[PDB]
mmCIF file of C-alpha atoms and ligand atoms in Angstrom:
data_model
loop_
_atom_site.group_PDB
_atom_site.id
_atom_site.type_symbol
_atom_site.label_atom_id
_atom_site.label_comp_id
_atom_site.label_asym_id
_atom_site.label_seq_id
_atom_site.Cartn_x
_atom_site.Cartn_y
_atom_site.Cartn_z
ATOM 1 C CA UNK A 1 -63.641 -36.286 6.215
ATOM 2 C CA UNK A 2 -65.130 -39.571 7.439
ATOM 3 C CA UNK A 3 -67.648 -39.906 4.610
ATOM 4 C CA UNK A 4 -64.888 -39.123 2.094
ATOM 5 C CA UNK A 5 -62.833 -41.934 3.694
ATOM 6 C CA UNK A 6 -65.621 -44.528 3.760
ATOM 7 C CA UNK A 7 -66.422 -44.108 0.064
ATOM 8 C CA UNK A 8 -62.847 -44.793 -0.953
ATOM 9 C CA UNK A 9 -62.617 -47.729 1.433
ATOM 10 C CA UNK A 10 -65.782 -49.139 -0.133
ATOM 11 C CA UNK A 11 -64.262 -48.458 -3.554
ATOM 12 C CA UNK A 12 -61.098 -50.279 -2.480
ATOM 13 C CA UNK A 13 -63.185 -53.218 -1.254
ATOM 14 C CA UNK A 14 -61.670 -52.815 2.229
ATOM 15 C CA UNK A 15 -64.437 -54.454 4.213
ATOM 16 C CA UNK A 16 -65.291 -54.619 7.910
ATOM 17 C CA UNK A 17 -65.364 -58.428 7.731
ATOM 18 C CA UNK A 18 -61.591 -58.339 7.131
ATOM 19 C CA UNK A 19 -60.740 -57.754 10.801
ATOM 20 C CA UNK A 20 -59.445 -54.359 11.941
ATOM 21 C CA UNK A 21 -57.968 -53.400 8.534
ATOM 22 C CA UNK A 22 -60.778 -50.992 7.732
ATOM 23 C CA UNK A 23 -60.568 -49.166 11.058
ATOM 24 C CA UNK A 24 -56.796 -48.931 10.617
ATOM 25 C CA UNK A 25 -56.942 -47.644 7.054
ATOM 26 C CA UNK A 26 -59.525 -45.061 8.070
ATOM 27 C CA UNK A 27 -57.243 -43.699 10.802
ATOM 28 C CA UNK A 28 -53.737 -43.862 9.207
ATOM 29 C CA UNK A 29 -54.643 -42.697 5.685
ATOM 30 C CA UNK A 30 -56.184 -39.307 4.857
ATOM 31 C CA UNK A 31 -58.601 -38.496 2.035
ATOM 32 C CA UNK A 32 -55.923 -37.397 -0.437
ATOM 33 C CA UNK A 33 -53.919 -40.611 -0.044
ATOM 34 C CA UNK A 34 -57.000 -42.808 -0.412
ATOM 35 C CA UNK A 35 -57.868 -41.045 -3.664
ATOM 36 C CA UNK A 36 -54.349 -41.723 -4.944
ATOM 37 C CA UNK A 37 -54.799 -45.391 -4.071
ATOM 38 C CA UNK A 38 -58.127 -45.352 -5.878
ATOM 39 C CA UNK A 39 -56.446 -43.781 -8.921
ATOM 40 C CA UNK A 40 -53.910 -46.609 -8.928
ATOM 41 C CA UNK A 41 -56.710 -49.151 -8.619
ATOM 42 C CA UNK A 42 -58.766 -47.691 -11.457
ATOM 43 C CA UNK A 43 -55.681 -47.449 -13.717
ATOM 44 C CA UNK A 44 -55.298 -51.184 -13.062
ATOM 45 C CA UNK A 45 -52.093 -51.363 -10.963
ATOM 46 C CA UNK A 46 -53.996 -52.371 -7.846
ATOM 47 C CA UNK A 47 -56.487 -55.220 -7.893
ATOM 48 C CA UNK A 48 -57.280 -55.294 -4.176
ATOM 49 C CA UNK A 49 -55.756 -53.755 -1.060
ATOM 50 C CA UNK A 50 -55.338 -56.180 1.821
ATOM 51 C CA UNK A 51 -53.953 -56.445 5.332
ATOM 52 C CA UNK A 52 -52.092 -53.737 7.161
ATOM 53 C CA UNK A 53 -48.454 -54.791 7.503
ATOM 54 C CA UNK A 54 -46.970 -51.909 9.458
ATOM 55 C CA UNK A 55 -48.090 -48.615 10.937
ATOM 56 C CA UNK A 56 -45.336 -46.148 11.711
ATOM 57 C CA UNK A 57 -44.537 -42.523 12.423
ATOM 58 C CA UNK A 58 -43.266 -41.709 8.893
ATOM 59 C CA UNK A 59 -44.896 -44.371 6.738
ATOM 60 C CA UNK A 60 -47.501 -47.133 6.755
ATOM 61 C CA UNK A 61 -47.165 -50.438 4.869
ATOM 62 C CA UNK A 62 -50.024 -52.516 3.375
ATOM 63 C CA UNK A 63 -50.423 -55.712 1.426
ATOM 64 C CA UNK A 64 -52.003 -55.508 -2.052
ATOM 65 C CA UNK A 65 -52.801 -57.733 -4.994
ATOM 66 C CA UNK A 66 -51.958 -55.890 -8.182
ATOM 67 C CA UNK A 67 -50.636 -56.047 -11.706
ATOM 68 C CA UNK A 68 -47.178 -55.317 -12.994
ATOM 69 C CA UNK A 69 -45.495 -56.433 -16.234
ATOM 70 C CA UNK A 70 -48.900 -57.725 -17.242
ATOM 71 C CA UNK A 71 -48.756 -60.332 -14.470
ATOM 72 C CA UNK A 72 -50.581 -60.425 -11.128
ATOM 73 C CA UNK A 73 -48.125 -59.658 -8.339
ATOM 74 C CA UNK A 74 -48.168 -59.684 -4.545
ATOM 75 C CA UNK A 75 -47.400 -56.097 -3.520
ATOM 76 C CA UNK A 76 -46.233 -54.198 -0.557
ATOM 77 C CA UNK A 77 -47.720 -50.728 -0.725
ATOM 78 C CA UNK A 78 -45.610 -48.301 1.270
ATOM 79 C CA UNK A 79 -47.226 -44.967 2.015
ATOM 80 C CA UNK A 80 -45.511 -41.895 3.473
ATOM 81 C CA UNK A 81 -47.750 -39.803 5.759
ATOM 82 C CA UNK A 82 -48.477 -36.454 4.140
ATOM 83 C CA UNK A 83 -47.013 -35.015 7.313
ATOM 84 C CA UNK A 84 -38.763 -33.318 9.555
ATOM 85 C CA UNK A 85 -35.516 -34.849 10.833
ATOM 86 C CA UNK A 86 -34.567 -36.537 7.552
ATOM 87 C CA UNK A 87 -33.162 -33.417 5.948
ATOM 88 C CA UNK A 88 -29.446 -34.164 5.830
ATOM 89 C CA UNK A 89 -30.418 -37.188 3.733
ATOM 90 C CA UNK A 90 -32.368 -35.059 1.285
ATOM 91 C CA UNK A 91 -30.257 -31.909 0.898
ATOM 92 C CA UNK A 92 -26.664 -32.898 0.228
ATOM 93 C CA UNK A 93 -27.785 -35.705 -2.082
ATOM 94 C CA UNK A 94 -26.728 -34.355 -5.487
ATOM 95 C CA UNK A 95 -29.875 -35.556 -7.224
ATOM 96 C CA UNK A 96 -32.015 -33.258 -5.057
ATOM 97 C CA UNK A 97 -29.683 -30.596 -3.706
ATOM 98 C CA UNK A 98 -30.441 -28.165 -6.546
ATOM 99 C CA UNK A 99 -34.183 -28.836 -6.625
ATOM 100 C CA UNK A 100 -37.219 -27.087 -5.150
ATOM 101 C CA UNK A 101 -37.946 -28.864 -1.877
ATOM 102 C CA UNK A 102 -41.304 -27.195 -1.256
ATOM 103 C CA UNK A 103 -42.990 -28.152 2.073
ATOM 104 C CA UNK A 104 -46.150 -29.393 0.296
ATOM 105 C CA UNK A 105 -43.977 -31.394 -2.137
ATOM 106 C CA UNK A 106 -41.373 -32.692 0.321
ATOM 107 C CA UNK A 107 -43.005 -36.045 1.133
ATOM 108 C CA UNK A 108 -43.595 -36.702 -2.579
ATOM 109 C CA UNK A 109 -39.956 -36.000 -3.337
ATOM 110 C CA UNK A 110 -38.998 -38.412 -0.540
ATOM 111 C CA UNK A 111 -41.193 -41.132 -2.053
ATOM 112 C CA UNK A 112 -39.617 -40.503 -5.426
ATOM 113 C CA UNK A 113 -36.160 -40.739 -3.853
ATOM 114 C CA UNK A 114 -36.937 -44.093 -2.328
ATOM 115 C CA UNK A 115 -38.318 -45.383 -5.662
ATOM 116 C CA UNK A 116 -35.194 -44.223 -7.510
ATOM 117 C CA UNK A 117 -32.945 -45.747 -4.852
ATOM 118 C CA UNK A 118 -34.806 -49.048 -5.166
ATOM 119 C CA UNK A 119 -34.365 -49.094 -8.978
ATOM 120 C CA UNK A 120 -30.707 -48.108 -8.645
ATOM 121 C CA UNK A 121 -29.971 -50.796 -6.085
ATOM 122 C CA UNK A 122 -32.026 -53.473 -7.797
ATOM 123 C CA UNK A 123 -30.382 -52.874 -11.161
ATOM 124 C CA UNK A 124 -26.929 -53.040 -9.597
ATOM 125 C CA UNK A 125 -27.775 -56.540 -8.292
ATOM 126 C CA UNK A 126 -28.517 -55.623 -4.653
ATOM 127 C CA UNK A 127 -31.314 -57.638 -3.044
ATOM 128 C CA UNK A 128 -34.160 -55.103 -2.596
ATOM 129 C CA UNK A 129 -37.869 -55.565 -3.375
ATOM 130 C CA UNK A 130 -38.547 -55.072 -7.087
ATOM 131 C CA UNK A 131 -39.969 -51.525 -7.358
ATOM 132 C CA UNK A 132 -43.077 -51.406 -9.572
ATOM 133 C CA UNK A 133 -44.359 -47.873 -9.528
ATOM 134 C CA UNK A 134 -45.081 -44.814 -7.422
ATOM 135 C CA UNK A 135 -47.494 -41.903 -7.286
ATOM 136 C CA UNK A 136 -47.414 -38.951 -4.961
ATOM 137 C CA UNK A 137 -46.779 -40.465 -1.463
ATOM 138 C CA UNK A 138 -47.536 -44.044 -2.596
ATOM 139 C CA UNK A 139 -44.937 -46.705 -3.465
ATOM 140 C CA UNK A 140 -45.870 -50.054 -4.997
ATOM 141 C CA UNK A 141 -43.223 -52.760 -4.797
ATOM 142 C CA UNK A 142 -42.552 -56.484 -4.669
ATOM 143 C CA UNK A 143 -44.066 -58.236 -1.594
ATOM 144 C CA UNK A 144 -41.345 -59.981 0.415
ATOM 145 C CA UNK A 145 -43.031 -63.005 1.993
ATOM 146 C CA UNK A 146 -45.706 -65.496 0.981
ATOM 147 C CA UNK A 147 -49.458 -65.900 1.317
ATOM 148 C CA UNK A 148 -49.747 -62.279 2.478
ATOM 149 C CA UNK A 149 -47.424 -62.606 5.444
ATOM 150 C CA UNK A 150 -44.180 -60.609 5.313
ATOM 151 C CA UNK A 151 -40.821 -62.305 5.624
ATOM 152 C CA UNK A 152 -39.370 -61.705 9.088
ATOM 153 C CA UNK A 153 -36.856 -58.939 9.649
ATOM 154 C CA UNK A 154 -33.605 -59.942 11.335
ATOM 155 C CA UNK A 155 -34.722 -58.566 14.690
ATOM 156 C CA UNK A 156 -37.982 -60.585 14.350
ATOM 157 C CA UNK A 157 -35.833 -63.654 13.760
ATOM 158 C CA UNK A 158 -33.754 -62.949 16.850
ATOM 159 C CA UNK A 159 -32.589 -66.155 18.496
ATOM 160 C CA UNK A 160 -33.933 -68.126 15.609
ATOM 161 C CA UNK A 161 -30.803 -66.933 13.788
ATOM 162 C CA UNK A 162 -28.830 -69.436 15.858
ATOM 163 C CA UNK A 163 -30.937 -72.079 14.168
ATOM 164 C CA UNK A 164 -29.920 -70.639 10.795
ATOM 165 C CA UNK A 165 -26.738 -70.054 8.820
ATOM 166 C CA UNK A 166 -26.114 -66.858 10.783
ATOM 167 C CA UNK A 167 -22.602 -66.463 9.412
ATOM 168 C CA UNK A 168 -23.959 -67.032 5.883
ATOM 169 C CA UNK A 169 -26.733 -64.499 6.504
ATOM 170 C CA UNK A 170 -24.096 -62.044 7.713
ATOM 171 C CA UNK A 171 -22.014 -62.622 4.549
ATOM 172 C CA UNK A 172 -25.156 -62.102 2.442
ATOM 173 C CA UNK A 173 -25.692 -58.757 4.130
ATOM 174 C CA UNK A 174 -22.048 -57.795 3.588
ATOM 175 C CA UNK A 175 -22.167 -58.794 -0.105
ATOM 176 C CA UNK A 176 -25.269 -56.637 -0.527
ATOM 177 C CA UNK A 177 -23.640 -53.619 1.185
ATOM 178 C CA UNK A 178 -20.627 -54.174 -1.081
ATOM 179 C CA UNK A 179 -22.803 -54.229 -4.242
ATOM 180 C CA UNK A 180 -24.779 -51.238 -2.964
ATOM 181 C CA UNK A 181 -21.544 -49.292 -2.502
ATOM 182 C CA UNK A 182 -19.481 -50.515 -5.498
ATOM 183 C CA UNK A 183 -22.121 -50.980 -8.248
ATOM 184 C CA UNK A 184 -25.086 -48.882 -7.138
ATOM 185 C CA UNK A 185 -22.820 -46.230 -5.594
ATOM 186 C CA UNK A 186 -25.260 -45.740 -2.714
ATOM 187 C CA UNK A 187 -24.965 -45.912 1.094
ATOM 188 C CA UNK A 188 -28.122 -47.209 2.811
ATOM 189 C CA UNK A 189 -27.486 -44.864 5.730
ATOM 190 C CA UNK A 190 -29.953 -46.583 8.114
ATOM 191 C CA UNK A 191 -28.940 -50.267 7.760
ATOM 192 C CA UNK A 192 -30.010 -52.356 10.756
ATOM 193 C CA UNK A 193 -31.759 -55.521 11.861
ATOM 194 C CA UNK A 194 -34.977 -53.507 11.553
ATOM 195 C CA UNK A 195 -34.747 -53.117 7.760
ATOM 196 C CA UNK A 196 -33.155 -56.347 6.571
ATOM 197 C CA UNK A 197 -35.685 -59.083 5.824
ATOM 198 C CA UNK A 198 -34.888 -62.761 5.266
ATOM 199 C CA UNK A 199 -36.561 -65.375 3.106
ATOM 200 C CA UNK A 200 -34.062 -67.713 1.438
ATOM 201 C CA UNK A 201 -31.620 -64.820 1.409
ATOM 202 C CA UNK A 202 -31.592 -61.216 2.650
ATOM 203 C CA UNK A 203 -33.422 -58.211 1.245
ATOM 204 C CA UNK A 204 -32.755 -54.630 2.219
ATOM 205 C CA UNK A 205 -35.813 -52.341 2.714
ATOM 206 C CA UNK A 206 -36.490 -48.699 3.650
ATOM 207 C CA UNK A 207 -34.194 -46.985 1.085
ATOM 208 C CA UNK A 208 -35.760 -43.539 1.283
ATOM 209 C CA UNK A 209 -32.695 -42.089 3.045
ATOM 210 C CA UNK A 210 -29.970 -43.788 0.966
ATOM 211 C CA UNK A 211 -27.472 -41.321 -0.541
ATOM 212 C CA UNK A 212 -25.003 -41.595 -3.447
ATOM 213 C CA UNK A 213 -21.285 -41.712 -2.685
ATOM 214 C CA UNK A 214 -21.057 -38.020 -3.600
ATOM 215 C CA UNK A 215 -22.994 -37.060 -0.494
ATOM 216 C CA UNK A 216 -20.352 -35.633 1.836
ATOM 217 C CA UNK A 217 -21.406 -37.876 4.761
ATOM 218 C CA UNK A 218 -21.594 -40.997 2.623
ATOM 219 C CA UNK A 219 -18.457 -42.613 4.010
ATOM 220 C CA UNK A 220 -19.484 -41.776 7.540
ATOM 221 C CA UNK A 221 -22.932 -43.282 6.891
ATOM 222 C CA UNK A 222 -21.295 -46.406 5.505
ATOM 223 C CA UNK A 223 -19.084 -47.023 8.512
ATOM 224 C CA UNK A 224 -22.080 -46.465 10.754
ATOM 225 C CA UNK A 225 -23.944 -49.141 8.704
ATOM 226 C CA UNK A 226 -20.994 -51.548 8.966
ATOM 227 C CA UNK A 227 -20.455 -51.080 12.718
ATOM 228 C CA UNK A 228 -24.181 -51.445 13.207
ATOM 229 C CA UNK A 229 -24.354 -54.760 11.352
ATOM 230 C CA UNK A 230 -21.267 -56.232 12.987
ATOM 231 C CA UNK A 231 -22.589 -55.349 16.446
ATOM 232 C CA UNK A 232 -25.966 -56.918 15.757
ATOM 233 C CA UNK A 233 -24.547 -60.175 14.407
ATOM 234 C CA UNK A 234 -22.140 -60.300 17.321
ATOM 235 C CA UNK A 235 -25.123 -61.147 19.552
ATOM 236 C CA UNK A 236 -25.678 -64.303 17.521
ATOM 237 C CA UNK A 237 -22.145 -65.561 17.298
ATOM 238 C CA UNK A 238 -20.734 -63.958 14.154
ATOM 239 C CA UNK A 239 -17.101 -62.966 14.673
ATOM 240 C CA UNK A 240 -16.180 -60.207 12.304
ATOM 241 C CA UNK A 241 -13.619 -57.420 12.136
ATOM 242 C CA UNK A 242 -14.690 -53.840 11.303
ATOM 243 C CA UNK A 243 -11.559 -52.978 9.321
ATOM 244 C CA UNK A 244 -11.742 -56.094 7.154
ATOM 245 C CA UNK A 245 -15.443 -55.759 6.402
ATOM 246 C CA UNK A 246 -15.169 -52.010 5.607
ATOM 247 C CA UNK A 247 -12.236 -52.672 3.233
ATOM 248 C CA UNK A 248 -14.162 -55.536 1.635
ATOM 249 C CA UNK A 249 -17.132 -53.258 1.039
ATOM 250 C CA UNK A 250 -15.081 -50.396 -0.346
ATOM 251 C CA UNK A 251 -12.769 -52.532 -2.509
ATOM 252 C CA UNK A 252 -9.517 -52.029 -0.612
HETATM 253 N N1 TO1 B 301 -40.350 -51.610 1.876
HETATM 254 C C1 TO1 B 301 -41.000 -52.307 2.541
HETATM 255 C C2 TO1 B 301 -41.576 -53.249 3.291
HETATM 256 C C3 TO1 B 301 -41.864 -53.131 4.702
HETATM 257 N N2 TO1 B 301 -42.479 -54.308 5.035
HETATM 258 C C4 TO1 B 301 -42.943 -54.596 6.400
HETATM 259 O O1 TO1 B 301 -43.253 -53.413 7.141
HETATM 260 C C5 TO1 B 301 -42.342 -53.243 8.240
HETATM 261 C C6 TO1 B 301 -41.751 -51.845 8.179
HETATM 262 O O2 TO1 B 301 -40.482 -51.879 7.507
HETATM 263 C C7 TO1 B 301 -41.298 -54.334 8.097
HETATM 264 O O3 TO1 B 301 -41.131 -54.938 9.373
HETATM 265 C C8 TO1 B 301 -41.949 -55.371 7.243
HETATM 266 O O4 TO1 B 301 -42.617 -56.226 8.202
HETATM 267 C C9 TO1 B 301 -42.638 -55.154 4.012
HETATM 268 N N3 TO1 B 301 -43.177 -56.373 3.936
HETATM 269 C C10 TO1 B 301 -43.233 -57.072 2.820
HETATM 270 N N4 TO1 B 301 -42.717 -56.555 1.702
HETATM 271 C C11 TO1 B 301 -42.149 -55.349 1.578
HETATM 272 N N5 TO1 B 301 -41.637 -54.838 0.434
HETATM 273 C C12 TO1 B 301 -42.080 -54.543 2.793
#
């Protein structure tokens, strides 16, 4: 319960002096997840958990210092809550549509799916965070940002985009959608200003729902992604045609 939580927080060196992190961890993570994090720490993948980056309805995201490839890396640790709507994105994906989606296994299969989508995208040259490892409902990946503060998402940039190469940023997004579709053969299926981050270039995040092109709604998901992106960049002065961008992505 609460004693079980405190021991793992102590073990993870998540201290009260660190602001509200400890109170947040203790509420958003349950005993089973904390144990998994401790397993990853004791195995040597995690050096030290840090700040809480995001708390959500499906997942929570934390900063961590860890080790991957025998080097110390800044990590984002993305954790799916052990406890619906996502199902069309799970069933109907060929890689999972003949598998046993048990209720008590479902969240773990989702985490796995995101990890495999990250590897798939990354290896096809799409800008996503380098995936490092995963265990149960825990994903360890490359931290996008510096000095423990996450790069802004596009929506967090907002008007600041007018102070940037907004057309260039748009073209970066389109090029990544095109690589995702053509080389990785995936459709993001929830692409928006809420899951594109920007440092010196764009990175796509939140790939749990991405489906291969063999998913029967894949082309519908794509056009939804493309319309979504064009409409968002329209607010910041990017003039783009749906037809042309969709053809560009698909290779027509
Ligand atoms: N996947 C992932 C990540 C999510 N986030 C954060 O959580 C928020 C929720 O999406 C987002 O607004 C961003 O602020 C990340 N931050 C740094 N590196 C990462 N790899 C991630």
